[PDB]
Amino acid sequence: PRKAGVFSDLSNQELKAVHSFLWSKKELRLQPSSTTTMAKNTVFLIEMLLPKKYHVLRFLDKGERHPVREARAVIFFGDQEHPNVTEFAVGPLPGPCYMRALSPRPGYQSSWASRPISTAEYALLYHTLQEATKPLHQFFLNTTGFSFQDCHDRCLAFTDVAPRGVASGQRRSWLIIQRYVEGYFLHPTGLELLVDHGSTDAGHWAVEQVWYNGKFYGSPEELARKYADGEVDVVVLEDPLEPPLFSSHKPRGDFPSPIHVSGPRLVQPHGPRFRLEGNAVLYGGWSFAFRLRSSSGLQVLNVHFGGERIAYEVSVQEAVALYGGHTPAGMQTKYLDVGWGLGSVTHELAPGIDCPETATFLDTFHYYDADDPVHYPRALCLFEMPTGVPLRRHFNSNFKGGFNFYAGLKGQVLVLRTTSTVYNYDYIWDFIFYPNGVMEAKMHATGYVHATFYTPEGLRHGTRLHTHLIGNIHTHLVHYRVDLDVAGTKNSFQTLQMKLENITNPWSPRHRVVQPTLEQTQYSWERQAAFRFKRKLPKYLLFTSPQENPWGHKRSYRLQIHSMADQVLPPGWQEEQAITWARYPLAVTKYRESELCSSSIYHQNDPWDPPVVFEQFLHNNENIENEDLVAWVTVGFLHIPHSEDIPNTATPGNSVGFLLRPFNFFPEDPSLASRDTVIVWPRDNGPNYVQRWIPEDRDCSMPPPFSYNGTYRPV
Amino acid sequence: RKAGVFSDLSNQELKAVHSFLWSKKELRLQPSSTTTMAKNTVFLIEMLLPKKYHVLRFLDKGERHPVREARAVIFFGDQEHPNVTEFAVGPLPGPCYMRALSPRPGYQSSWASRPISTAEYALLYHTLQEATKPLHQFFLNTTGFSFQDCHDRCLAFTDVAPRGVASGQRRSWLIIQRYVEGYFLHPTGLELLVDHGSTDAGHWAVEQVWYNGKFYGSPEELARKYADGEVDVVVLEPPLFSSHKPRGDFPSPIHVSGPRLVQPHGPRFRLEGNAVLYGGWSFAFRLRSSSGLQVLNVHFGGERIAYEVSVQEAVALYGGHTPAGMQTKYLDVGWGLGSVTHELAPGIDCPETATFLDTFHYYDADDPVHYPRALCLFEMPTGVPLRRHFNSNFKGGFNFYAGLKGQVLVLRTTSTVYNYDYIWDFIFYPNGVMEAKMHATGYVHATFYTPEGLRHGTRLHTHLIGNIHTHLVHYRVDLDVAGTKNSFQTLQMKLENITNPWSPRHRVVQPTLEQTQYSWERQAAFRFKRKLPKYLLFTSPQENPWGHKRSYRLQIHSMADQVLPPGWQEEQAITWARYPLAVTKYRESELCSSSIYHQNDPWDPPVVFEQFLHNNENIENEDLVAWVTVGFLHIPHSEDIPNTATPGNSVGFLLRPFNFFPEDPSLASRDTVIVWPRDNGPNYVQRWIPEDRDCSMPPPFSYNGTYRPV
């Protein structure tokens, strides 16, 4: 269990140790992230940097030494003539002595433009807007009752969309202006503004274009003028500030059948049945470690069942929302969430709501756009829950008014969960473990939709959800890395299909038997195992070991994809270079340390020329027979918003993911070791014998009272 | 309750229909249990739904309760030309009449088409026992079991269907097995073809014999060749591999019970008879002995969504190396899918807190039979909030957290015809989303291992091949979105490529929303070849407050494909499986896509789904019916031993509100919690129901396992 520490995130202490070491190098001229100038040197991100798999596996499987522990440190070098972003690996931990180059990209010049936005930058943007929009002040008051200057409880706000321009190196953002009320995401005013904020001197920043209610205007002054001269068809918004605001979660309406009491709840009188210690988990047959990468999010590592490895890594790689729109902001929006620290917006899970009251809730620390490491309460939870459906059951009838036996095993699952709330949407990320060796990855979508100001032309790109509101059409796409090591590193990939044959009926020569047969297809090269959305995806996608089970069949795990995704952008066109993985519901690559990730934090702001292009992993078309393979999986769905998305998108029917299922891996059902199985047997002239291996439970316990903090701060 | 119009027959009603028929002396009725085929007997009695026209006038326009009737299926075997005839028996209470249903002029295979029965099995077993006497020593030597003086070491058989090569035949292949715990997985290597068509069991014959990859013609021939050394024979306390009993050890053993649901404040749904209320939901349900579970007159927010959602048929289509294997196309409505609803075990099949419901079936029985805990109805936490949001202030704090705990209402039954157990769910979420689901578990259909079998399945044990097969299920989904008259429409994303309106030298290539209308049935019949649109909408002409048509969306969760070749022989029985989705104009002559007869005459069945589409009717502003196929290929694997498990082995569909309600319909729920910050104090936790931490105990576990007349 101490071995799982190799996969563990950095502690508050280690984050501080790395930050202090960076600050001790006076030549870096490092300033705090909150300093409100772009022309500064700052440490933007610090997170644990996984050691090489070769070394980890020798540590884990061969008794060799613990690999050196390091942190990734991303430094924004704004305080120089040619600003750039450079990454380092800082180590060792404990006792940092060195910073070495990490992911160097020599000859690329747009790193500064590619960098994530930051709190300091937002503050300066708000300053830029307050000055630049002064001509529109009276316009603001007349059309909205809110303002940017001299506001207190009636402030305008903005939401920036990305990417930021039409080509690599640009940092020109469209901004959707909204009223800052409860659920402000759903309150666009009809104004959108394009700001060039590329220069490290914010005094050079300019609103270069203005869109209001269907027309472009060139500058704030021009719109002000034309409005003053009565030449603008404006939409005067009603006052927002008894009934709840449409964008509030507050209850309204009544069901015809009143519900006055709390619903059923999980109790756990015996406590957890899994063993969670640090980042190590044991649960029946299962053994795995986890981590929460601040940049990209949740990972489960070194996953075993039955004491045998199944997967070295399963991890979220990227999550995107690709929009169409009638407004410039809407037609600009391709959100890539790793560009926003998908793994560090893991905000507090509410006990009894976000996870069961019986869950184990876990804190973490993140250092992402911060002056010090920040404590995130209840960032993750781990819990066992009844699925409501038995894992297996059978009624063995005697067909004479009775039975020979009933047998059943109550359905339970272990769930590891976190969330990501960057801004409007809340994604819920689950890794789920079933007692029979099946594991499942799942994303659910909830929170607020990305929405723009209603005009009639908007109906070609979305749905009217309220008086002044359009929910823009978009597609959610998530990419997963699935480094399966089925019973070991060396695997192959094959598929199975049903194929009909047409033979002479062997017992009636005058007749035919047209019937299913089992067809196996082997795959030798990466390109053969790169399935595009147009291609027919076989029903059995198997990752196999050369080892056979006792019945002569190769030991395999099957990948089963649950998705409504499709090709969204045209392959090869401009920003689509950022998301070439989204060409493939499944693609298989040969493992490589230079190919651990399909995305990065830089992809959002330079989608034209990003540091990783997944398609390039397929270029060399490597042999994949008896090799360390990585499966990569795209899942997602088209979301055409509808009125039921107000105030929030709901989770029912809004999840996607995949299952990993053993297929001839174990000699028989691996859940047979469960002692929860019950078999009822008849007895002549008596009550039935209920055979158990664990006593019947009716015990009771109570969860702690509900609490919720809502703050996240350094400790 | 008006939902009584949809209710199944009570014990009293079943007895009343049976008594009435038995009082007609000219019918010459005898009990199902009488062990001759040359008898007249009432095979099945269940409630026969009135016409939708009359039901809606009763429900919606305050008119008379429709006439209540029973469907009665009579096997007329005691006549020169045996047949099956169905009757409408009514009225109820106090039956007077008996009216013949659905004639088929020119169809001659009625008797052959009829389901197998207990009495037919007793006669088959007698035939096998007699016909296999020459193989007695062969049986003992090769298996240690036999049919004679066998006691604890008896052979058994599993029949496959369909039963022959053409309409009118009744020639069944029988898989010989050792009768032990989980006998389904113990084939001996012997299969037997028996012609049992004549009403005189005296005429029944073993016409062919298959053993370990060779045909032998008769039991006598196999016996002689065995004696003469001319047969390649396979000669066949930890638990048996076919047993559920625990063995093996987890690396981290678990010794205590897992978490459980408690419901100290009682159910939050209201059940009165067959009528259910739950938050916004109102619906009725029935358990049709022939075809299985239905939900009817489904309402949310006082508005109708669907008149009927029902299981229509469930099939398992096999390939194989053995003749039984290559013969098997099971169609479970042919086995009374809805009357093998055996006892739900509290805590396992449904939560300990569930409401368990009994029912009565009259299917191949002498009297109506009580089935304890045949269905269950329960609310359970889903473990994922229906909605949640963390509204950050981006300065180390928050403006609010809002969340609604996930709960769902589940209505469940099962069907275990024999080896497999299907679990049938209809699931209702608080936001107006309903879901249908089937899960497969129980024992696989399996045959004797030879090397040749590996082309049609997987070796799962020493002597066992798990045959490859596809599961396909058909649902009838009579959506009545806000009313009877609807249209069908699909939406897709289509890209446009325009001049970037703020940078003219550049392009915007972006999503647009494309809407497709459908005017004729055939346009809305989607084959598995065709690309299925992402939005499948059934729409009312009514608009929501924002100008969009009020609709429900159908979202299918399936791995199905075309299995049999269209137009080829038995595929005639399952033409519906050509279509993941097809839409028809409502017709009283097309209430069902299958029947109890399809299994035993798949070549010339009484209902051919394809014919529903032949008139290619207008579906603009009509009473529409969606028909949905879901399923999956199952290539068996060793983890299916002793049973297939439910994780990942489920299919179904969702029905989702799409611009039907002005905003999220779950906003009426008082379970929502909002946490607000407070200046210089603790947070305000706003609730509309008090926090609850009460615990209580459920009923102690019990299980009966018998199903008898009352």
Ligand SMILES: *[C@@H]1O[C@H](CO)[C@@H](O[C@@H]2O[C@H](CO)[C@@H](O[C@@H]3O[C@H](CO)[C@@H](O)[C@H](O)[C@@H]3O)[C@H](O)[C@H]2NC(C)=O)[C@H](O)[C@H]1NC(C)=O
């Ligand atoms: C991104 O910015 C960093 C930091 O500004 C660059 O690294 C720095 O490169 C300079 C040379 O350009 C190094 O500074 C010093 O140069 C003098 C030359 O007179 C030399 O005598 C000193 O020994 C020293 O090297 C500096 O060491 C180095 N800083 C770090 C932290 O590595 C980096 O090259 C820029 N990247 C790109 C792609 O332009």
Ligand SMILES: *[C@@H]1O[C@H](CO)[C@@H](O[C@@H]2O[C@H](CO)[C@@H](O)[C@H](O)[C@H]2NC(C)=O)[C@H](O)[C@H]1NC(C)=O
């Ligand atoms: C399976 O193969 C058989 C044999 O080739 C096909 O049967 C022939 O079908 C044609 C009509 O298309 C007839 O003219 C022949 O008389 C048939 N021959 C025999 C020997 O029966 C049959 O159609 C094939 N079926 C499928 C579904 O592929």
Ligand SMILES: *[C@@H]1O[C@H](CO)[C@@H](O[C@@H]2O[C@H](CO)[C@@H](O)[C@H](O)[C@H]2NC(C)=O)[C@H](O)[C@H]1NC(C)=O
């Ligand atoms: C959220 O958690 C923080 C950390 O525990 C709380 O801060 C503490 O507040 C208590 C008052 O009950 C003081 O006794 C401590 O001195 C505080 N500790 C620190 C480190 O600041 C804070 O009260 C909680 N906030 C809410 C809204 O519940």
Ligand SMILES: *[C@@H]1O[C@H](CO)[C@@H](O[C@@H]2O[C@H](CO)[C@@H](O)[C@H](O)[C@H]2NC(C)=O)[C@H](O)[C@H]1NC(C)=O
């Ligand atoms: C199936 O058998 C039934 C019962 O023998 C036949 O029904 C009888 O038909 C005769 C002559 O048409 C009538 O006089 C009787 O009233 C019928 N008896 C009953 C109980 O309805 C029927 O003709 C046969 N069906 C077919 C299609 O041949």
Ligand SMILES: *[C@@H]1O[C@H](CO)[C@@H](O[C@@H]2O[C@H](CO)[C@@H](O)[C@H](O)[C@H]2NC(C)=O)[C@H](O)[C@H]1NC(C)=O
């Ligand atoms: C979108 O449309 C534009 C304009 O038709 C296409 O751009 C043209 O592409 C051809 C071939 O590459 C060039 O020779 C022309 O110079 C381009 N014209 C302009 C005005 O840019 C573009 O290829 C289209 N993109 C997609 C993905 O369909």
Ligand SMILES: *[C@@H]1O[C@H](CO)[C@@H](O[C@@H]2O[C@H](CO)[C@@H](O)[C@H](O)[C@H]2NC(C)=O)[C@H](O)[C@H]1NC(C)=O
């Ligand atoms: C299953 O249920 C039946 C019906 O309730 C039980 O039969 C009853 O058993 C009690 C206890 O001896 C008798 O006094 C009653 O006369 C029985 N009632 C009927 C209608 O038979 C039966 O015992 C139960 N079986 C099992 C195995 O639990």
Ligand SMILES: N=C(N)c1ccc(OCCCCCOc2ccc(C(=N)N)cc2)cc1
């Ligand atoms: N779905 C999307 N991609 C997305 C949608 C809208 C949006 O527009 C508002 C601007 C974001 C305002 C808040 O931005 C951050 C950034 C990083 C962290 C962090 N990692 N700590 C926390 C908050 C941004 C992203």
Ligand SMILES: N=C(N)c1ccc(OCCCCCOc2ccc(C(=N)N)cc2)cc1
């Ligand atoms: N999957 C399949 N289709 C199936 C698989 C195997 C099988 O093999 C042995 C025969 C079954 C013996 C029991 O048959 C019945 C019939 C009807 C009822 C009823 N509805 N009451 C109850 C039991 C039968 C069906």
Ligand SMILES: [Ca+2]
């Ligand atoms: Ca490669």
Ligand SMILES: [Ca+2]
């Ligand atoms: Ca691998």
Ligand SMILES: [Ca+2]
């Ligand atoms: Ca028609």
Ligand SMILES: [Ca+2]
């Ligand atoms: Ca309808």
Ligand SMILES: [Cu+2]
């Ligand atoms: Cu969405």
Ligand SMILES: [Cu+2]
């Ligand atoms: Cu199956």
